[PDB]
Design a protein around this nucleic acid. Structure first.
Ligand SMILES: [Mg+2]
Ligand SMILES: [Mg+2]
Ligand SMILES: [Mg+2]
Ligand SMILES: [Mg+2]
Ligand SMILES: [Mg+2]
Ligand SMILES: [Mg+2]
Ligand SMILES: [Mg+2]
Ligand SMILES: [Mg+2]
Ligand SMILES: [Mg+2]
Ligand SMILES: [Mg+2]
Ligand SMILES: [Mg+2]
Ligand SMILES: [Mg+2]
Ligand SMILES: [Mg+2]
Ligand SMILES: [Mg+2]
Ligand SMILES: [Mg+2]
Ligand SMILES: [Mg+2]
Ligand SMILES: [Mg+2]
Ligand SMILES: [Mg+2]
Ligand SMILES: [Mg+2]
Ligand SMILES: [Mg+2]
Ligand SMILES: [Mg+2]
Ligand SMILES: [Mg+2]
Ligand SMILES: [Mg+2]
Ligand SMILES: [Mg+2]
Ligand SMILES: [Mg+2]
Ligand SMILES: [Mg+2]
Ligand SMILES: [Mg+2]
Ligand SMILES: [Mg+2]
Ligand SMILES: [Mg+2]
Ligand SMILES: [Mg+2]
Ligand SMILES: [Mg+2]
Ligand SMILES: [Mg+2]
Ligand SMILES: [Mg+2]
Ligand SMILES: [Mg+2]
Ligand SMILES: [Mg+2]
Lengths: 25, 185, 67, 60, 260, 144
RNA sequence: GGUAGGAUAGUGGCCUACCAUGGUUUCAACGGGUAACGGGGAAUAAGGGUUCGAUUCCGGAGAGGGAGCCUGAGAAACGGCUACCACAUCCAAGGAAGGCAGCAGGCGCGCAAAUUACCCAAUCCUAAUUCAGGGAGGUAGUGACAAUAAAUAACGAUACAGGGCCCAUUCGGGUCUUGUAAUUGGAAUGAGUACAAUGUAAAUACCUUAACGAGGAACAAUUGGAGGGCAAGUCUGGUGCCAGCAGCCGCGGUAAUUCCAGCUCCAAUAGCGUAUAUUAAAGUUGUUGCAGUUAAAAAGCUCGUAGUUGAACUUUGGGCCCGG
RNA sequence: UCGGCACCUUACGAGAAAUCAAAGUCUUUGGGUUCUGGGGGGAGUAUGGUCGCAAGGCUGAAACUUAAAGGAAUUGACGGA
């Protein structure tokens, strides 16, 4: 865990978590 | 609904529960003055702190400032009256220099021993509490009675409660009742 | 012993001013045989119900349960 | 944090501790007379002064 | 709430009655009367706490219901009768005439007087105003209305009330050099007549007063009661003349008469 | 001028800045947001009774190695599920399944004590008959 | 906000009619939360502060919720009424009745909080009233909330402790007995129990006291500890990374100073531990008084409004007199 | 000599030190002022608002978990130095 590489993993999950709310809306 | 009956605590505890310096010193005090607890030491230490801080703010004022002239000379007068502060050395610098054994000497348990009459401090406390020694003609069974330098002459065995006169005593009677019972008429 | 004392100018004028329990103590009065505290208050509240001398309800009820 | 360890062994050591009773002794005094008995045993009738003072000397 | 209160809590009483904190939950509430609730002294407080004639508040009732006490010559059988300042209290038996005046500590003195002084009293003029049918009247500090005064009598003065017929005998004008009895606050019970009077048009007039020992003390005009000329009081002053000996001087006297 | 404003008229900017930076404490953020009553199973209390479901044996954390002998407790007042340590040699035989226990915090104001993972409460009384006074010999458990 | 009226006990947008477009806000309005009644005050505190205040006094509000009203000087009253809502009682089913956030009590909630006792004697209050009434109040009961004082032993002869005298020579001598003898002595007293008196409204208790009342003076003090922090054991028996302890660091895998026990010792002592909160500790909230290179912390940079802050300059000195 | 980018030497001082004429004039603590921090994670995450065509930006938690994480220097050890 380089914090930059944890970031692009998190930014991936930031998209998916706001996809699953637009999925349910 | 009534007046709240005012109460206060008469002692305080050290900030450190186990100091070798403090625990040996007080056990020396408790065996010297025949004390029961450290609470009897903590009581005097709490009296000293208020008395010491009652002069520290007074000394921070001017001198001839009349509160210091009133409260300070009244502060000395009670200490001089009780025997803690001597008949010489009457100043606010010398109420700060007071210590625990100054007050402990003025206890009735100490003075019943200091004025003859007790042959221990551990026999002094079991004379006082056992309804012997009177101070005026008043029977005192309090060991921290704190004799006040004018009562010392009249400290004596009580008019009642033998060692003071007029009656034998409880187990003295029953022995003499038994000694009369077993011997004869 | 220390107390507080009174000597009145006459025995009858003692009896005017002195409280009753002191006079009960000395033989100069008898404690009244009133009923108890709650029994008085219970009897007072039962008698708050009736409006008047109650002889009329006494004769009406004794008429009604007789027949 | 496995939540299901064996519970059959609870109180094992206390049960297989052999019961040895407290020995009946003459009583010790209370309050002022015990602070008197501490005064002799630390400042009047003390003898062993090893290091500074040892109130519980273990047998060597 | 919902109207007038009938109870006085002990420890909500005025402090100058010297009522003990314990041994009873309630204080004697002053009734409606000539003087205010916090400026008066109920008869139970006088006859039990100040004179020690009554032990209870029941013996205050047993005294007043035999027509013994009389405030201003009238009997006033109320236990909580609000006898206040300058009130002459006559006891027929014991022959004692008292005048309720302030001792210098700010309390009510147990101050005996005699019958020629008990025959009258003083009253500070509260207001001068025309009544109906044009009749002028003056209002005193005990709420007495007296008709047809001297036209020279103004507010803040003092009149001498004959107390049998409630008539103005003479009046002491309010001017410089005349004995001021301070009647409220921390200066309660202090005499000394004058320095001057400062106006403050708008409210709360202030009066500068310097006593026998030349101690100036400023007081509001509404606590000022004029009781005479220079010297020569119109009433008997209490044991101490309102001088305010300080606590250093107060400890000096009590040691001066406790060794005899 | 060492950071802060010093001036006479700057009492507000100091007082706003104090409250702003006051939130970073552990107790002030907890007390003023009220998480004792909202979160935190013992809702601001000190002791909470509960009903015993289960007897868990929790593994002690490494480098220690023992089975810690807790119980699982549903609180009577709240219905929340907690794990409660049963402290002494033995004393798990003293609890039961399905009876009342008085609990407490264990002592670290939360923050599970030592080698015991997640267990932050202990047991004071079972049946109101006081585990310590049961453990010695002093009291007997109520049979029925 | 103006003008006029109505209403009021009266001021007043209090309401009504007409007219004007105001009033508040980054100096935090408006809004949301409060396990918020406000104050006197309380805990802790070198100083500054921090936290609490339902609660013996004072002011407010409320009597299940709301709303309306009668009487009366005084109430939008609740131990008054009326209505609805909610709850709930008796009934012969037509009806009728209710309001303990008064006092005692019950249930429930709970971690959590006592008597269905005695009296108006005190304090005071009410009334036609000196008399009557008073769960206001006072008295007792239960009561380790908190606070005060302070028993559980004391003093000796006997044993050996040793500090010794005249060089005790080698101990006697008229030493000086503190510790030690599950020895031996005669004294002291209240805990308790009671003749009585006092107390009290009546008692109970205290205060006083006749007769009784300690030899294991069983008339027995406990609560926590004994590796460090922290005062006190590398004693003995058991267990064997189990059981368990331990706030934290850490002890347990066969010699465990840390577990469980015996012994001994330590701390506080009629108290002590535990939990939670809060205060000091904490100069880890920093006004006093914190830190920002690298430990967490200078905005990427500049402008700029509120805020905060802002150069110097205007009667100086001298002489005299009174005067604590 | 004025102003600037730096540097060199010393260390009066400062600091935990590495170092620093500023990082000094700091318990002998007050020239003015802005912003930020409060043990490590969770987490620059969730949610809400806001900005952007979007990627994302700005604001920004808590539950829960943890007894250390970290800074600087010393000695060793090791380096496909
Ligand atoms: Mg006696
Ligand atoms: Mg009321
Ligand atoms: Mg600033
Ligand atoms: Mg108008
Ligand atoms: Mg108008
Ligand atoms: Mg009008
Ligand atoms: Mg509330
Ligand atoms: Mg408050
Ligand atoms: Mg309040
Ligand atoms: Mg109301
Ligand atoms: Mg009426
Ligand atoms: Mg109503
Ligand atoms: Mg009412
Ligand atoms: Mg009611
Ligand atoms: Mg109803
Ligand atoms: Mg009740
Ligand atoms: Mg309780
Ligand atoms: Mg009464
Ligand atoms: Mg009551
Ligand atoms: Mg005993
Ligand atoms: Mg006695
Ligand atoms: Mg140690
Ligand atoms: Mg062993
Ligand atoms: Mg042991
Ligand atoms: Mg500090
Ligand atoms: Mg810091
Ligand atoms: Mg950093
Ligand atoms: Mg920069
Ligand atoms: Mg940057
Ligand atoms: Mg600006
Ligand atoms: Mg300037
Ligand atoms: Mg240059
Ligand atoms: Mg943090
Ligand atoms: Mg952000
Ligand atoms: Mg977002």
């Amino acid at each position: 865990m380089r914090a930059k590489w944890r970031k692009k993993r998190t930014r991936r999950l930031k998209r998916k978590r706001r996809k699953v709310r637009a999925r349910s809306k | 609904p009534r007046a709240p009956r005012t109460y206060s605590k008469t002692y305080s505890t050290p900030k450190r529960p186990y100091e070798s310096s403090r625990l040996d010193a007080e056990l020396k005090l408790a065996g010297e003055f025949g004390l029961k607890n450290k609470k009897e030491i903590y009581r005097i230490s709490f009296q000293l702190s208020k008395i010491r801080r009652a002069a520290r703010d007074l000394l921070t004022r001017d001198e001839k400032d009349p509160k210091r002239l009133f409260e300070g000379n009244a502060l000395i007068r009670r200490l001089v009256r009780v025997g803690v502060l001597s008949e010489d050395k009457k100043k606010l610098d010398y109420v700060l220099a007071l210590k625990v054994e100054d007050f402990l000497e003025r206890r009735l348990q100490t003075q019943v021993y200091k004025l003859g009459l007790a042959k221990s401090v551990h026999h002094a406390r079991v004379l006082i509490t056992q309804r012997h020694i009177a101070v005026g003609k008043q029977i005192v069974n309090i060991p921290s009675f704190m004799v006040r330098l004018d009562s010392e002459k009249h400290i004596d065995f009580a008019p009642t409660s033998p060692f003071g006169g007029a009656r034998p005593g409880r187990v003295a009677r029953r022995n003499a009742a038994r000694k009369a019972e077993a011997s004869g008429e | 012993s220390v107390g507080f004392g009174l000597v009145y100018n006459s025995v009858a004028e003692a009896k005017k001013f002195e409280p009753t329990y002191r006079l009960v103590r000395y033989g100069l009065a008898e404690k009244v045989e009133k009923a108890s505290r709650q029994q008085r208050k219970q009897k007072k509240n039962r008698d708050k119900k009736i409006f008047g001398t109650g002889k009329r309800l006494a004769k009406k009820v004794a008429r009604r349960n007789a027949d | 944090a496995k939540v299901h360890g064996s519970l059959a062994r609870a109180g094992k050591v206390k049960s297989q501790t052999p019961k040895v009773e407290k020995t009946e002794k003459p009583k010790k005094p209370k309050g002022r007379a015990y602070k008197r008995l501490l005064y002799t045993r630390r400042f009047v009738n003390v003898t062993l002064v090893n290091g500074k003072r040892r109130m519980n000397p273990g047998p060597s | 709430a919902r109207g007038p209160k009938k109870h006085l809590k002990r420890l909500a009483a005025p402090h100058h009655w010297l009522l003990d904190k314990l041994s009873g939950c309630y204080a004697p509430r002053p009734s409606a009367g000539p003087h205010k609730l916090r400026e008066s002294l109920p008869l139970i407080v006088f006859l039990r706490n100040r004179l020690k004639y009554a032990l209870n508040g029941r013996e205050v009732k047993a005294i007043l219901m035999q027509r013994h006490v009389k405030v201003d010559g009238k009997v006033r059988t109320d236990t909580t009768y609000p006898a206040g300042f300058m009130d002459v209290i006559t006891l027929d038996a014991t022959n004692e005439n008292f005048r309720l005046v302030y001792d210098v500590k700010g309390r009510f003195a147990v101050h005996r007087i005699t019958d020629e002084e008990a025959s009258y009293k003083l009253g500070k003029v509260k207001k001068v105003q025309l009544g109906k049918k044009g009749v002028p009247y003056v209002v005193t500090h005990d709420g007495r209305t007296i008709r047809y005064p001297d036209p020279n009598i103004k507010v803040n003065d003092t009149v001498k009330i004959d107390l049998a017929s409630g008539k103005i005998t003479d009046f002491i004008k309010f001017d410089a050099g005349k004995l001021v009895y301070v009647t409220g606050g921390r200066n309660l019970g202090r005499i000394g007549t004058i320095v001057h009077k400062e106006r403050h048009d708008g409210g709360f007039d202030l009066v500068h007063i310097k006593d026998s020992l030349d101690n100036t003390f400023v007081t509001r005009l509404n606590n000022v009661f004029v009781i005479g000329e220079q010297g020569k009081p119109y009433i008997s002053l209490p044991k101490g003349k309102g001088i305010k000996l300080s606590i250093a001087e107060e400890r000096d006297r009590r040691r001066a008469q406790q060794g005899l | 001028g060492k950071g802060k404003p010093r001036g006479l008229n700057s009492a507000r900017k100091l007082r706003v800045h104090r409250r702003n930076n006051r939130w970073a404490e552990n107790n002030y953020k907890k007390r003023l947001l009220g998480t004792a009553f909202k979160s935190s199973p013992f809702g601001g209390s000190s002791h909470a009774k509960g009903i015993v479901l289960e007897k868990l044996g929790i593994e002690s954390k490494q480098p220690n190695s023992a089975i810690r002998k807790c119980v699982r407790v549903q609180l009577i007042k709240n219905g929340k599920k907690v794990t409660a340590f049963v402290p002494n040699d033995g004393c798990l035989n003293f609890v039961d399944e399905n009876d009342e226990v008085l609990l407490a915090g264990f002592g670290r104001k939360g923050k599970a004590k030592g080698d015991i993972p997640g267990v932050r409460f202990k047991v004071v009384k079972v049946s109101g008959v006081s585990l310590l006074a049961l453990w010695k010999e002093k009291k007997e458990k109520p049979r029925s």
